[PDB]
């Protein structure tokens, strides 16, 4: 039922110490927008994972020019402060839906209207911790030879292959995607 090359591929050099379930996304990515707002891929995968398996989500730079680097640093700020749930949707909608986020100051404004004080954002933005988080996201992308998003990796060894699943129907696609992660997570 689950064959290498159909629902998933296998990295030739597995990534030592990778997060068990690792998602890569970009706020510029249209498929990542639907994974968040329509398909809820992340919460559907989470419903089917075994006990205690942690899910990690990293932002990538190669979409959207110099604003893409700023969005990776902003996602680092969100992870450092734990405000992902308050900024994920306003950032997606400001980048892709309204296209009113076009600069670092527009990103900042999203965090402030979500309740993060400007002095707290500026401190985090310039911290060593966020510097380390930016480098961490870029290293994981390089370590899996990432070329596009959305992408999801299981135990640093298996890469989901959504174009090898049924993409004609949204509910079947979500169930095949989440069941593949569950199968691979038990390996
Ligand atoms: C039912 C459905 C099914 C879909 O199926 C996908 C899903 C993800 C991908 C991955 C992808 O888009 N990319 C970007 C290009 N590159 C270089 C990559 O490696 C990966 C593809 C099809 C997408 C949307 C919807 C909807 N509603």
């Amino acid at each position: 039922q689950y064959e290498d090359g159909k629902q998933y591929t296998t990295l030739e050099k597995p990534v030592a110490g990778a997060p068990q379930v690792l998602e890569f996304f970009s706020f510029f990515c249209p498929h990542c927008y639907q994974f968040e707002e329509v398909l809820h891929i992340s919460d559907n995968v989470k419903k089917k994972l075994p006990e205690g398996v942690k899910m990690t989500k990293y932002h990538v730079n190669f979409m959207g020019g110099d604003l893409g680097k700023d969005l990776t640093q902003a996602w680092a700020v969100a992870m450092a402060l734990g405000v992902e749930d308050k900024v994920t949707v306003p950032l997606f909608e400001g980048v892709q839906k309204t296209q009113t986020i076009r600069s670092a100051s527009d990103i900042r404004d999203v965090f402030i209207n979500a309740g993060i004080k400007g002095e707290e954002y500026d401190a985090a933005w310039n911290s060593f911790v966020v510097k380390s988080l930016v480098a961490q996201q870029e290293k994981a992308a390089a370590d899996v030879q990432l070329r596009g998003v959305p992408a999801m990796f299981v135990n640093g060894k298996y890469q989901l292959n959504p174009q090898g699943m049924d993409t004609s129907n949204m509910d079947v696609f979500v169930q095949q995607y989440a069941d593949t992660v569950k199968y691979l997570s038990e390996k």
Side-chain angles (χ1 to χ4, degrees), residues 1-2 4-5 7-46 48-50 52-53 55-65 67-68 70-84 86-101 103-116 118 121-156 158-187:
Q1 186 166 13
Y2 289 106
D4 193 316
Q7 304 99 333
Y8 66 91
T9 47
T10 299
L11 304 178
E12 179 190 50
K13 274 130 144 61
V15 172
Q20 305 171 93
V21 172
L22 174 56
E23 292 195 272
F24 286 96
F25 83 109
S26 166
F27 287 109
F28 281 106
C29 161
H31 275 165
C32 312
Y33 189 98
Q34 303 151 234
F35 275 28
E36 170 66 32
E37 293 225 1
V38 188
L39 297 176
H40 305 278
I41 280 286
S42 269
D43 293 326
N44 272 287
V45 165
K46 196 188 185 189
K48 292 178 163 171
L49 295 174
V53 172
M55 294 191 58
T56 310
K57 177 118 87 193
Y58 287 163
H59 195 271
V60 302
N61 310 339
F62 40 77
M63 302 221 197
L67 190 55
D70 289 331
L71 285 156
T72 294
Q73 193 163 344
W75 186 246
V77 166
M79 301 192 279
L81 298 184
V83 289
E84 300 97 320
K86 313 205 190 146
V87 306
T88 290
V89 172
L91 286 169
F92 263 122
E93 304 204 343
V95 161
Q96 295 184 46
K97 180 188 196 184
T98 51
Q99 318 225 321
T100 57
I101 296 180
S103 72
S105 158
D106 295 327
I107 295 173
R108 191 177 185 276
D109 291 335
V110 164
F111 280 76
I112 282 166
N113 297 131
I116 292 87
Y121 179 86
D122 294 329
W125 179 269
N126 287 298
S127 51
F128 283 108
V129 154
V130 160
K131 242 60 214 185
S132 164
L133 280 177
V134 169
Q136 200 186 101
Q137 286 170 103
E138 300 169 292
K139 188 190 180 283
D143 278 339
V144 300
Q145 304 170 316
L146 191 66
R147 299 199 189 262
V149 295
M152 190 194 280
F153 296 81
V154 179
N155 289 327
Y158 303 114
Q159 178 173 8
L160 276 273
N161 177 36
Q163 274 291 356
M165 309 174 177
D166 183 0
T167 67
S168 83
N169 175 300
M170 282 178 191
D171 307 308
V172 186
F173 176 76
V174 168
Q175 164 271 301
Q176 273 178 14
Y177 199 98
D179 284 346
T180 306
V181 173
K182 174 180 173 6
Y183 165 84
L184 296 172
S185 212
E186 285 139 5
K187 274 211 183 323

